[PDB]
């Protein structure tokens, strides 16, 4: 889904986000978004810390040469559960980026690139109590502080100082390196995190009176049919309020991530296999929206029928457009040998706003869009360059995931009479699964091949449903096993 | 070393270095002199001060004057 | 400021009653007012040293780079 | 506070000329920006050097266009009255209390 | 203001050097921003002996055009709002 | 925000687009806006410049204050602002 | 030296405000505001540096003033 | 004289302790109203 | 935990502890099945599992049996 | 809050002059003074430096382009000269 979002500049911003799975089994589905965006929010919930699924989309995202932005989500939870004091909040935040942040440097070498380093005070790191619905950056909330405070200094350094070991002096209305006085907080634990708790407990524990005066205190003015709701709606207006509009979001991807005319260009050069001599590579690397088109297909959903599945991919070079003719290039295209790619028509063409569809007349390059009518060669992945392009064409590698389908199940479809559309099923399952995995064997059976528990479990429940309405007997699951060596032979073995 | 502006100008006034400064669309009239003083409106309390008509090289002697800001051009130091 | 993105760079800045500056950029305030290093008036081909203009005596600035 | 400073900020100040000449009523002549002069007697003014002018009249000097190639014109002398006027300070040059 | 009464309204503009510029109206700013669609720069030649002064004031096609109220100093109907 | 007005705004969505810059002393100045000020302080780059005698110059980068500009020409394609439509009759 | 300083040690002292448009005002300093708007008194004038005339005490306004300079 | 945003309410009160409380509460006691 | 013997587990255990735990399993790595897989001394149960030191013999074993090979 | 655009943005419906900065002859009826001294007026002619008038129904002019106003012979001052020292 790309929504036209706000900066605190007022220029709207397309973002494209890509909602993800993030049970472990589902990386399948990561890798493809990933392959599609160049920059990546991990959203690392507040309260649990960092976790499997986290860190491993995180060497995802620095293998893919990716802009990796940390949302720390779910800070209610400091709040309201764990209830721990605003100081030891700053803590455990604190703690939760640090160790995001050490896990990239194991990967990236031990040591952080000053570009990748993920610290609040440049602006990378955004808060979230996305139920309760607000989140910022300390921009965000210098910037707040500058707005009802009236235009008394650039929320820039404001920011600048707002996290870290500094201490707002009352002295003189500066932040030090060192607490002036004996048990003064931090200049976040106060300056942020204080507000926050008196914010949350002014709502959680007191007369709606009182929360429509602390907040006629401050410019925010509710509209007496507010506090009415519970404790969680009032919660989430009143934040919302003095919370604002996502500002944090916008103004730290959009600064921190690319946009389209320099994603694409390292997005080929460390994807695409083909020779980048060649004009097309070229075409990508300005991002011309003008050249011939070169879309990387990574992902196919199906539709209302589940007969036909639309193609989500990146138009990254070229203008698409609905009635094309293009070679779909796909899996295991060869330029000595033609024979994996198919000639196929473009009908129409979307933005995907995850309930709906909106036809776009035209596909500019860097746009991500569901094009339709080229399901019929695509398994996983391919590659979309017109007809119109008499040039040697290559394809962008197939998804290195970070996950192997290392569970293994047998599949015999109840009635044989439906085998067919069993394995069309199957085959319409190679359509949705970019993991899965169907093998024929000297025993004639198809197994399949998935994560473990949920992936296949879900892949089960589709096949029996989506595609197939063939119900299908599965055997006990059985995971594939390799075979080794220990110690070499004594002797040479000749055939 | 990337330093202020208006050190800059503290290094103008103690080092106490003749200047001359342009003034507001005065291409033809430059204002040389020594700065004694200034504020954060940088009006430039200036010794010696001779101001320059370069067209035919005059320079009339003005003195300790206290230069306005808001006719303020250039601050270029008259070295060598 | 943009002039951020500018730092310690040789710069062409025009001033009223049409003049021309170049010099690398040293600083700058909220006013606008610019530090420079070596900069040349480019009217007399004079390089008149480290400098500051006013902010209303900047009409532009260009990079030549 | 801040009405009685401006107060004496009009009173000991160097404005304080016409607030004088708003008490005395006496004659002021006022040089414009463009250097028209106008001699008028002030009603009230602000902060801005705008100022609600009696008995205005203005004096210019106007050099007609002549033919090309003749002599530069005599310039003539004009003056227009109003009884009151607003007058706005950013046109204001000088302002000078007659001598009474 | 009174000019919200303005907004997809023609208009024309004089600036400061007497050159005319005019459009239609979109949004208005405090500080005597304007946004004009449509907008074309009429710009007064000086007027030849025996010509007419309506027939030869030089027009340039600007667009949609933006306009600082620093050097706006008038502002007229042109016409009705277009259709 | 609160207490901006709706064309600078315009100004700075206008961002990343190729845009017109006439200031007061009548030379143009066609440029891609990398990103403005509230004081209208902009900086372009690709810049065309176009002198009053007509001259045309290549220059890399403009940063061009605000108080000296006289009007923006910007395409049409972002005159479908939010603003544009929302404040709109229909 | 601060130009208030200046302007407030320069009071009654016999000052010249030379304006941007060359005019030259010399006279007493007898006040000046926030905002460096000048009272002169017995006030002499000069454009072109040539004497004009006097005008008495006059008003002069901030930004028609050049520089000034004590006498 | 920017301050704190915040700082002349008390970050903690006696009911808070409640309000947190009846948060984790079995579904009747969740609400204020119903 | 083995990738086999994961079969159930998430269930299991938060079976046996009421389910204030939750864990999560993602492929790690290989490592060498224990015993002899090509073993013949050890003749095994149908429908009982194996010991560790039978694992790797009846492992392939009933891989080559359900892939369609003899034992 | 100066004294002075205080009293102009009482101009309501005054049928007065201007003279605009470069020499411009405006003489219509006050509709609008607001804050920034920009007025609009209505029942207008406006006529330039060495131009031949032209009518407006309506027109706009920019605060700080003004030279001056000149105001009705008509004018009671010393009602509209009350009030301006009361803040509201």
Same mark, same amino acid.
């Given at each position: 889904?790309?929504?036209?979002?706000?900066? $605190?500049?007022?220029?709207?911003?397309?973002?494209?986000?890509?909602?993800?799975?993030? $049970?472990?089994?589902?990386?399948?589905?990561?890798?493809?978004?990933?392959?599609?965006?160049?920059?990546?929010?991990?959203?690392?919930?507040?309260?649990?810390?960092?976790?499997?699924?986290?860190?491993?989309?995180?060497?995802?995202?620095?293998?893919?040469?990716?802009?990796?932005?940390?949302?720390?989500?779910?800070?209610?939870?400091?709040?309201?559960?764990?209830?721990?004091?605003?100081?030891?909040?700053?803590?455990?935040?604190? $703690?939760?980026?640090?160790?995001?942040?050490?896990?990239?440097?194991?990967?990236? =070498?031990?040591?952080?690139?000053?570009?990748?380093?993920?610290?609040?005070?440049?602006?990378?790191?955004?808060?979230?109590?996305?139920?309760?619905?607000?989140?910022?950056?300390?921009?965000?909330?210098?910037?707040?502080?500058?707005?009802?405070?009236?235009?008394?200094?650039?929320?820039?350094?404001?920011?600048?100082?707002?996290?870290?070991?500094?201490?707002?002096?009352?002295?003189?209305?500066?932040?030090?390196?060192?607490?002036?006085?004996?048990?003064?907080?931090?200049?976040?634990?106060?300056?942020?995190?204080?507000?926050?708790?008196?914010?949350?407990?002014?709502?959680?524990?007191?007369?709606?009176?009182?929360?429509?005066?602390?907040?006629?205190?401050?410019?925010?003015?509710?509209?007496?049919?507010?506090?009415?709701?519970?404790?969680?709606?009032?919660?989430?207006?009143?934040?919302?309020?003095?919370?604002?509009?996502?500002?944090?979001?916008?103004?730290?991807?959009?600064?921190?991530?690319?946009?389209?005319?320099?994603?694409?260009?390292?997005?080929?050069?460390?994807?695409?296999?083909?020779?980048?001599?060649?004009?097309?590579?070229?075409?990508?690397?300005?991002?011309?929206?003008? =050249?011939?088109?070169?879309?990387?297909?990574?992902?196919?959903?199906?539709?209302?029928?589940?007969?036909?599945?639309?193609?989500?991919?990146?138009?990254?070079?070229?203008?698409?457009?609905?009635?094309?003719?293009?070679?779909?290039?796909?899996?295991?295209?060869?330029?000595?040998?033609?024979?994996?790619?198919?000639?196929?028509?473009?009908?129409?063409?979307?933005?995907?706003?995850?309930?709906?569809?909106?036809?776009?007349?035209?596909?500019?390059? =860097?746009?991500?869009?569901?094009?339709?009518?080229?399901?019929?060669?695509?398994?996983?992945?391919?590659?979309?360059?017109?007809?119109?392009?008499?040039?040697?064409?290559?394809?962008?590698?197939?998804?290195?995931?970070?996950?192997?389908?290392?569970?293994?199940?047998?599949?015999?479809?109840?009635?044989?009479?439906?085998?067919?559309?069993?394995?069309?099923?199957?085959?319409?399952?190679?359509?949705?699964?970019?993991?899965?995995?169907?093998?024929?064997?000297?025993? =004639?059976?198809?197994?399949?091949?998935?994560?473990?528990?949920?992936?296949?479990?879900?892949?089960?429940?589709?096949?029996?449903?989506?595609?197939?309405?063939?119900?299908?007997?599965?055997?006990?699951?059985?995971?594939?096993?390799?075979?080794?060596?220990?110690?070499?032979?004594?002797?040479?073995?000749?055939? | 070393?990337?330093?202020?502006?208006?050190?800059?100008?503290?290094?103008?006034?103690?080092?106490?270095?003749?200047?001359?400064?342009?003034?507001?669309?005065?291409?033809?009239?430059?204002?040389?002199?020594?700065?004694?003083?200034?504020?954060?409106?940088?009006?430039?309390?200036?010794?010696?001060?001779?101001?320059?008509?370069?067209?035919?090289?005059?320079?009339?002697?003005?003195?300790?004057?206290?230069?306005?800001?808001?006719?303020?051009?250039?601050?270029?130091?008259?070295?060598? | 400021?943009?002039?951020?993105?500018?730092?310690?760079?040789?710069?062409?800045?025009?001033?009223?009653?049409?003049?021309?500056?170049?010099?690398?950029?040293?600083?700058?305030?909220?006013?606008?007012?610019?530090?420079?290093?070596?900069?040349?008036?480019?009217?007399?081909?004079?390089?008149?040293?480290?400098?500051?203009?006013?902010?209303?005596?900047?009409?532009?600035?260009?990079?030549?780079? | 506070?801040?009405?009685?400073?401006?107060?004496?900020?009009?009173?000991?100040?160097?404005?304080?000329?016409?607030?004088?000449?708003?008490?005395?009523?006496?004659?002021?002549?006022?040089?414009?920006?463009?250097?028209?002069?106008?001699?008028?007697?002030?009603?009230?003014?602000?902060?801005?050097?705008?100022?609600?002018?009696?008995?205005?009249?203005?004096?210019?000097?106007?050099?007609?266009?002549?033919?090309?190639?003749?002599?530069?014109?005599?310039?003539?002398?004009?003056?227009?009255?109003?009884?009151?006027?607003?007058?706005?300070?950013?046109?204001?040059?000088?302002?000078?209390?007659?001598?009474? | 203001?009174?000019?919200?009464?303005?907004?997809?309204?023609?208009?024309?503009?004089?600036?400061?050097?007497?050159?005319?510029?005019?459009?239609?109206?979109?949004?208005?700013?405090?500080?005597?921003?304007?946004?004009?669609?449509?907008?074309?720069?009429?710009?007064?030649?000086?007027?030849?002996?025996?010509?007419?002064?309506?027939?030869?004031?030089?027009?340039?096609?600007?667009?949609?055009?933006?306009?600082?109220?620093?050097?706006?100093?008038?502002?007229?109907?042109?016409?009705?709002?277009?259709? | 925000?609160?207490?901006?007005?709706?064309?600078?705004?315009?100004?700075?969505?206008?961002?990343?687009?190729?845009?017109?810059?006439? %200031?007061?002393?009548?030379?143009?100045?066609?440029?891609?806006?990398?990103?403005?000020?509230?004081?209208?302080?902009?900086? %372009?780059?690709?810049?065309?410049?176009?002198?009053?005698?007509?001259?045309?110059?290549? %220059?890399?980068?403009?940063?061009?204050?605000?108080?000296?500009?006289?009007?923006?020409?910007?395409?049409?394609?972002?005159?479908?602002?939010?603003?544009?439509?929302?404040?709109?009759?229909? | 030296?601060?130009?208030?300083?200046?302007?407030?040690?320069?009071?009654?002292?016999?000052?010249?405000?030379?304006?941007?448009?060359?005019?030259?005002?010399?006279?007493?300093?007898?006040?000046?505001?926030?905002?460096?708007?000048?009272?002169?008194?017995?006030?002499?004038?000069?454009?072109?540096?040539?004497?004009?005339?006097?005008?008495?005490?006059?008003?002069?306004?901030?930004?028609?003033?050049?520089?000034?300079?004590?006498? | 004289?920017?301050?704190? #945003? #915040?700082?002349?309410?008390? #970050?903690?009160?006696?009911?808070?302790?409640?309000?947190?409380?009846? #948060?984790?509460?079995?579904?009747?006691?969740?609400?204020?109203?119903? | 935990?083995?990738?086999?013997?994961?079969?159930?587990?998430?269930?299991?255990?938060?079976?046996?502890?009421?389910?204030?735990?939750?864990?999560?399993?993602?492929?790690?790595?290989?490592?060498?099945?224990?015993?002899?897989?090509?073993?013949?001394?050890?003749?095994?149960?149908?429908?009982?599992?194996?010991?560790?030191?039978?694992?790797?013999?009846?492992?392939?074993?009933?891989?080559?049996?359900?892939?369609?090979?003899?034992? | 809050?100066?004294?002075?655009?205080?009293?102009?943005?009482?101009?309501?419906?005054?049928?007065?002059?201007?003279?605009?900065?470069?020499?411009?002859?405006?003489?219509?009826?006050?509709?609008?003074?607001?804050?920034?001294?920009?007025?609009?007026?209505?029942?207008?002619?406006?006529?330039?430096?060495?131009?031949?008038?032209?009518?407006?129904?309506?027109?706009?002019?920019?605060?700080?382009?003004?030279?001056?106003?000149?105001?009705?012979?008509?004018?009671?001052?010393?009602?509209?000269?009350?009030?301006?020292?009361?803040?509201?």
């Amino acid at each position: 889904m790309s929504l036209v979002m706000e900066s $605190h500049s007022g220029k709207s911003f397309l973002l494209n986000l890509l909602d993800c799975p993030g $049970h472990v089994n589902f990386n399948d589905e990561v890798t493809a978004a990933m392959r599609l965006a160049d920059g990546v929010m991990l959203v690392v919930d507040a309260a649990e810390g960092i976790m499997v699924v986290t860190e491993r989309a995180v060497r995802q995202a620095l293998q893919e040469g990716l802009s990796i932005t940390l949302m720390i989500s779910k800070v209610d939870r400091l709040i309201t559960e764990l209830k721990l004091p605003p100081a030891d909040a700053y803590h455990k935040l604190r $703690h939760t980026i640090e160790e995001v942040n050490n896990l990239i440097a194991a990967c990236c =070498g031990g040591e952080v690139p000053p570009e990748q380093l993920l610290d609040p005070v440049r602006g990378n790191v955004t808060f979230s109590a996305a139920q309760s619905g607000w989140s910022f950056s300390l921009q965000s909330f210098a910037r707040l502080y500058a707005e009802i405070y009236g235009a008394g200094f650039d929320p820039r350094e404001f920011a600048k100082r707002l996290w870290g070991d500094l201490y707002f002096v009352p002295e003189d209305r500066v932040f030090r390196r060192t607490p002036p006085r004996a048990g003064v907080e931090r200049s976040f634990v106060q300056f942020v995190l204080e507000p926050l708790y008196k914010m949350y407990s002014a709502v959680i524990g007191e007369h709606p009176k009182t929360v429509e005066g602390l907040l006629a205190g401050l410019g925010v003015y509710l509209r007496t049919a507010t506090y009415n709701l519970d404790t969680k709606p009032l919660l989430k207006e009143v934040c919302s309020s003095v919370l604002g509009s996502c500002a944090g979001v916008v103004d730290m991807l959009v600064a921190h991530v690319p946009p389209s005319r320099k994603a694409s260009a390292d997005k080929v050069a460390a994807h695409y296999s083909g020779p980048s001599d060649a004009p097309a590579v070229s075409f990508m690397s300005a991002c011309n929206p003008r =050249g011939p088109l070169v879309v990387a297909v990574a992902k196919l959903f199906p539709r209302q029928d589940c007969s036909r599945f639309d193609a989500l991919g990146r138009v990254m070079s070229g203008t698409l457009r609905p009635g094309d003719t293009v070679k779909v290039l796909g899996e295991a295209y060869t330029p000595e040998d033609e024979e994996d790619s198919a000639v196929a028509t473009v009908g129409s063409v979307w933005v995907y706003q995850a309930r709906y569809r909106v036809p776009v007349a035209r596909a500019t390059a =860097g746009n991500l869009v569901l094009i339709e009518g080229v399901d019929a060669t695509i398994t996983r992945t391919a590659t979309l360059v017109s007809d119109a392009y008499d040039e040697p064409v290559h394809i962008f590698r197939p998804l290195r995931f970070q996950t192997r389908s290392t569970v293994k199940i047998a599949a015999e479809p109840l009635n044989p009479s439906e085998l067919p559309k069993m394995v069309e099923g199957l085959r319409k399952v190679s359509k949705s699964y970019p993991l899965c995995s169907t093998r024929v064997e000297e025993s =004639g059976e198809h197994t399949i091949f998935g994560t473990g528990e949920m992936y296949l479990d879900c892949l089960m429940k589709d096949l029996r449903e989506l595609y197939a309405e063939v119900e299908v007997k599965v055997a006990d699951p059985v995971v594939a096993f390799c075979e080794t060596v220990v110690e070499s032979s004594s002797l040479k073995c000749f055939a | 070393i990337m330093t202020q502006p208006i050190n800059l100008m503290f290094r103008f006034l103690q080092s106490k270095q003749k200047v001359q400064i342009w003034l507001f669309d005065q291409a033809d009239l430059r204002v040389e002199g020594r700065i004694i003083g200034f504020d954060e409106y940088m009006n430039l309390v200036l010794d010696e001060a001779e101001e320059v008509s370069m067209k035919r090289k005059t320079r009339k002697t003005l003195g300790r004057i206290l230069l306005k800001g808001d006719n303020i051009t250039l601050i270029q130091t008259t070295g060598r | 400021p943009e002039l951020k993105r500018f730092m310690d760079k040789k710069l062409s800045i025009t001033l009223n009653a049409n003049r021309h500056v170049s010099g690398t950029l040293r600083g700058f305030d909220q006013f606008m007012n610019l530090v420079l290093d070596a900069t040349v008036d480019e009217k007399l081909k004079v390089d008149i040293g480290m400098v500051v203009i006013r902010g209303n005596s900047i009409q532009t600035i260009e990079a030549l780079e | 506070e801040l009405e009685k400073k401006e107060e004496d900020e009009y009173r000991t100040g160097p404005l304080s000329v016409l607030t004088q000449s708003v008490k005395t009523n006496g004659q002021v002549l006022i040089n414009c920006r463009n250097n028209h002069k106008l001699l008028a007697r002030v009603k009230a003014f602000d902060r801005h050097c705008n100022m609600i002018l009696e008995n205005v009249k203005e004096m210019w000097t106007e050099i007609p266009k002549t033919g090309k190639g003749q002599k530069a014109s005599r310039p003539v002398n004009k003056d227009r009255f109003v009884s009151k006027m607003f007058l706005r300070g950013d046109s204001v040059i000088m302002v000078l209390r007659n001598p009474k | 203001s009174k000019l919200l009464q303005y907004i997809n309204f023609r208009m024309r503009v004089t600036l400061v050097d007497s050159r005319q510029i005019v459009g239609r109206f979109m949004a208005f700013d405090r500080h005597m921003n304007l946004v004009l669609g449509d907008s074309e720069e009429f710009r007064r030649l000086p007027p030849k002996k025996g010509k007419s002064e309506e027939e030869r004031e030089e027009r340039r096609v600007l667009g949609l055009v933006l306009l600082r109220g620093e050097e706006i100093v008038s502002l007229t109907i042109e016409g009705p709002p277009p259709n | 925000a609160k207490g901006i007005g709706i064309p600078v705004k315009l100004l700075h969505e206008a961002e990343g687009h190729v845009v017109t810059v006439e %200031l007061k002393s009548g030379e143009m100045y066609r440029g891609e806006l990398c990103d403005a000020e509230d004081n209208m302080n902009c900086q %372009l780059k690709d810049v065309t410049a176009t002198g009053r005698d007509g001259r045309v110059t290549q %220059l890399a980068h403009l940063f061009i204050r605000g108080s000296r500009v006289r009007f923006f020409i910007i395409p049409d394609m972002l005159k479908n602002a939010p603003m544009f439509k929302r404040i709109d009759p229909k | 030296v601060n130009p208030k300083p200046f302007l407030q040690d320069l009071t009654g002292k016999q000052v010249i405000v030379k304006l941007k448009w060359g005019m030259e005002y010399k006279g007493y300093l007898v006040s000046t505001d926030s905002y460096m708007n000048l009272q002169l008194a017995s006030t002499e004038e000069y454009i072109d540096g040539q004497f004009t005339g006097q005008l008495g005490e006059v008003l002069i306004r901030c930004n028609n003033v050049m520089y000034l300079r004590g006498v | 004289g920017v301050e704190p #945003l #915040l700082g002349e309410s008390p #970050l903690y009160t006696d009911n808070t302790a409640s309000g947190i409380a009846l #948060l984790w509460a079995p579904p009747p006691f969740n609400r204020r109203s119903g | 935990l083995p990738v086999v013997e994961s079969f159930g587990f998430e269930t299991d255990l938060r079976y046996h502890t009421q389910g204030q735990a939750f864990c999560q399993s993602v492929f790690d790595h290989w490592q060498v099945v224990p015993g002899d897989p090509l073993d013949k001394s050890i003749v095994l149960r149908p429908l009982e599992p194996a010991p560790v030191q039978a694992l790797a013999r009846e492992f392939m074993v009933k891989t080559r049996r359900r892939k369609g090979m003899s034992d | 809050m100066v004294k002075l655009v205080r009293f102009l943005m009482k101009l309501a419906n005054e049928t007065v002059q201007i003279e605009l900065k470069n020499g411009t002859v405006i003489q219509g009826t006050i509709a609008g003074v607001d804050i920034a001294m920009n007025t609009h007026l209505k029942a207008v002619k406006l006529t330039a430096r060495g131009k031949n008038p032209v009518s407006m129904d309506h027109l706009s002019v920019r605060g700080n382009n003004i030279r001056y106003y000149i105001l009705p012979d008509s004018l009671n001052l010393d009602t509209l000269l009350v009030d301006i020292d009361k803040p509201k």
